[PDB]
Amino acid sequence: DNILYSGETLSPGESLNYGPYTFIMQQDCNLVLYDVDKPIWASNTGGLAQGCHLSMQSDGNLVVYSPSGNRIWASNTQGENGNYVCIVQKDRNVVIYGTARWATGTNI
Amino acid sequence: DNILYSGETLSPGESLNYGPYTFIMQQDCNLVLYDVDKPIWASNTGGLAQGCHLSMQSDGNLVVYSPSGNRIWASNTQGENGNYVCIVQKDRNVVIYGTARWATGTNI
Amino acid sequence: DNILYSGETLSPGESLNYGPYTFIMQQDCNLVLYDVDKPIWASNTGGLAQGCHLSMQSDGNLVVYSPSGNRIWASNTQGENGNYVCIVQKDRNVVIYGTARWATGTNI
Amino acid sequence: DNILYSGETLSPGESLNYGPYTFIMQQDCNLVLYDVDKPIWASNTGGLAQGCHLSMQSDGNLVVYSPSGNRIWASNTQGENGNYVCIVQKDRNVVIYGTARWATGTNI
Ligand SMILES: OC[C@H]1O[C@@H](O)[C@@H](O)[C@@H](O)[C@@H]1O
Ligand SMILES: OC[C@H]1O[C@@H](O)[C@@H](O)[C@@H](O)[C@@H]1O
Ligand SMILES: OC[C@H]1O[C@@H](O)[C@@H](O)[C@@H](O)[C@@H]1O
Numbered sequence A, B, C, D: 001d002n003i004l005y006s007g008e009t010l011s012p013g014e015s016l017n018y019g020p021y022t023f024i025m026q027q028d029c030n031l032v033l034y035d036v037d038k039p040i041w042a043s044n045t046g047g048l049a050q051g052c053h054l055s056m057q058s059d060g061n062l063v064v065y066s067p068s069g070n071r072i073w074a075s076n077t078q079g080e081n082g083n084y085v086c087i088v089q090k091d092r093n094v095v096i097y098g099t100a101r102w103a104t105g106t107n108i
């Protein structure tokens, strides 16, 4: 609910949430962080397309894609292939972390 | 509740939780991942001391310390100084990620 | 979280949250349910005072109080004395339930 | 999550969770509240059947049913037809509340 894992996408209208904080891939292709109803950060890509999705990729890049498979905005954080996370944190920061350094190996 | 940030500690009896998954720093100094009442992973340090704390450090090492400030168990993942997270994931894996590659910079 | 128990208050600026839904006791004494940035319900008491708190009472009434201990808005649901909950639900309804009909009695 | 709404069921192996607290409809038809790995309350119906479901009914009764549609255990809280909730609370109590006294009417 507040974590996007590498290999997952937010569809249009979908969000990560922590308390009053919402990080949403809007239908107007703007990527916005709201504190209640106040925009605090945006990709500033509102109106460049419709029906965009947000991908957290295996190369560590967070990308807004238009439905033509066309890059609209990116974090520009391509690097090592592996596992990454994008988190809406309790401190209201949105952060990409990776690669994975250690695991219990208890996945299902 | 399912994330430990670098610079934070779990005190004795404290846990990270996702649904039926509990990752707990026990009073007997064992670090255990439970699926409901079933231990699925442990540090196997039960009885080596009392009143241990778990630290997620800035160097990326997850360490169980005894109250004498003495290292009892570690992930052995020291590297670059920065920001890391330890997550109890929805897939029941416990994972350390870092360093931070990008942020909105919207922290309070 | 998404539950206010009878005997608790939301202070000014505090909220109940479920995913993109935020139920906030605003600084301007308006009680508002937001879906992301869109107000979908309000007490319509914005500007009648400053520094109001929301109280879920053991008589089952949800009341906005001004700092003079003065009733500004209420659900008008006074009844049996007991335990009640106010919930921001997954279906985006905000509901008062009570009284308590049964419990395990496993409270701390 | 930590709420079961009237009209919903927990299937075998499914749980309500708050932090280290797990309320599970087990495969062995026992209904158990665990604090980490410690059972603190049970229906004591382990082994009376297999593949039971827990149902929070609109008559306010919480019932364990066997797959033959047969009552195995109940809270015995039948009353007014309406909307009820069963909650695993932050205080580690499991409580049934209802009926609904008030709502915003903002459901989807
Ligand atoms: O090695 C760690 C990785 O293991 C995978 O199976 C998943 O659980 C990933 O989320 C995780 O990053
Ligand atoms: O640069 C990213 C870092 O910024 C800090 O202020 C915190 O929000 C950290 O959790 C985060 O890793
Ligand atoms: O008996 C039910 C009541 O028990 C109390 O001690 C608390 O746990 C209340 O939240 C609950 O409604």
Ligand SMILES: OC[C@H]1O[C@@H](O)[C@@H](O)[C@@H](O)[C@@H]1O
Residues within 6 Å of the ligand: C089, C091, C093, C095, D005, D083, D084, D100, D102, D103, D107
């Ligand atoms: O009127 C109250 C009821 O409204 C219904 O439509 C649902 O949202 C129920 O969960 C709720 O109890």
